[PDB]
Each structure stands twice: as structure tokens, then as C-alpha cells.
Structure 1
């Protein structure tokens, strides 16, 4: 599913993402936008390390979910990577929360550092009623 901007903003708010671990909804929106364009079935294979990024937040198989084909990978979110390709984002959100409970917080995603950190992210939630 490819979410529309405000549709996603309200979906994330209902899932408890607003201010989760000090991260605003606008930041989560900026992350999803740059990671997948709000597409829950986005996938990106990394030929270099044989891992794959899954879903709306492009969560990596080496550490977060199990896809059975990433060498020596772990599964910290304890989900099959398929759970991160569902139209319903509840599981992807639970896993994103788990990701940020790590040392780096929202900085875990390099794209957030590239396109969201120290940027004006207000635009992502403007007019969404969140």
C-alpha cells in the first residue's frame, strides 16, 4: 500500500508514534517519505552485504527481521520480514519503536540523518490534524 501523506500521519499517531522516544510525528513522516515514499511493500536488496531493507521504514534484515537468507543475521523485532510488507503497518511500527530504543535513536536510519536531521520537517504533518 502507498499511503497518502495525512492518511499516514493519522495512522502513525493512532499507533502511538507521536513523541515515541522523543521523536515527533513529523520526523517519522520524514523518515517514511525518504525511505519508501510511504510504500509498505518497498524492498531494497543490498548486494554488498546480502541484506534486504523491508517496508515503509526500510528496516534491515541483518538485524531486525528474519528472511532466512541474510548470512549470520539476527531478528531483534522477532518477526518474519514479511510482517514488514503488510498494508497494515502495526508490526512495522512496533519494529520501528524497537529500532529507536537502541543507542542511536532516530539516527539509526542514515536517510533520516541525510534528509531530516536539522531540517524543517513541519511540512510533513501540516494540515493532517495531528
Structure 2
């Protein structure tokens, strides 16, 4: 599923990301924009052999099991395929664990490079929610 901007904002709010760990809704929408272009089916292989999955590009090195990332962990206790669903529940629940690990949203390189420090409220401007 490719979400619209306001559609994803509303879904993320419903799923409890608004101000989760102190990160306003626009931070999460901005991260999803640049990680996946709002496409739940996005996948990208990393040089080390791990793969990033879903709207928030969650990495099989640590967070999910894909059966092909030797020596990795599965800290969200989910198959990586669950992160590709049209329903964002699995991605949101795993993202909540990631953002709570100590480094906040800096875990998402696209967030650090393209959202951090910017007017992220623009990502939710005009949305009904």
C-alpha cells in the first residue's frame, strides 16, 4: 500500500506514534516519506547482507527475522514480512521499540539527514487526523 501523507499521519496517530518518546507526528511522517516514500512494500538490501523492510525500513540485522541475515537478532520478535503489510501495526510496534533503545530517531538515517532540525510540522499541515 502507498499511503497518502495525511492518511499515514492519521494512521500513525491512531497507532500511538504522536509524541511517542517525545517525537511529534511530523517526525514520523517525515521519516516514512524519506525511508519508503510511504510504500508499505518497500525493501532495500544493505551491503552487509541485511535488508530493510516496510514504511520505516526496519533492519533485519537487529529487529526482525528474514532467515537470510546470519548472526542477526530479531528484537521485535516478528518475521520481516510482517513489516510489509497494508496495516501498519507491526511496523509501528517495532518502531516503538527501536526509538526507545537509547538513540531515539537517530536510528533512522534518513530521519537524521533529512528530517531532524527541520520544520517537520509541515508534514501534517492541513490534515484532518
* Normalised TM-score (structure 1): 0.97
Q: CA deviation at 1:120?
A: 1.2
State how far apart, in whole Å, the 2-side matches of 1:107 and 1:33 are: 15
State how far apart, in whole Å, the 2-side matches of 1:113 and 1:127 are: 24
Cα deviation per residue 1:59-110 (whole Å; 9 max; x = unaligned)?
Answer: 0000000001001000000000011010100111000001001110111111
User: What SS does the corresponding residue of 1:50 show, helix, strand or coil?
Assistant: coil
Partner of 2:110: 111
User: What SS does the corresponding residue of 1:44 show, helix, strand or coil?
Assistant: strand
Partner of 2:42: 42
Cα deviation per residue 1:32-54 (whole Å; 9 max; x = unaligned)?
Answer: 000000000000011x2000000
Gaps of 5+ in 1: none
Partner of 1:18: 18
Q: CA deviation at 1:122?
A: 1.6
State how far apart, in whole Å, the 2-side matches of 1:64 and 1:108 are: 12
User: What SS does the corresponding residue of 1:16 show, helix, strand or coil?
Assistant: coil
State how far apart, in whole Å, the 1-side matches of 2:13 and 2:128 are: 10
State how far apart, in whole Å, the 2-side matches of 1:99 and 1:110 are: 13
Matched length: 129
Cα deviation per residue 1:13-34 (whole Å; 9 max; x = unaligned)?
Answer: 0001100010110000000000
Gaps of 5+ in 2: none
User: What SS does the corresponding residue of 1:124 show, helix, strand or coil?
Assistant: helix
**Counterpart mapping for 1:1-130 below 5 A:** 1-46=1-46, 48-130=47-129
C-alpha RMSD of matched pairs (Å): 0.7
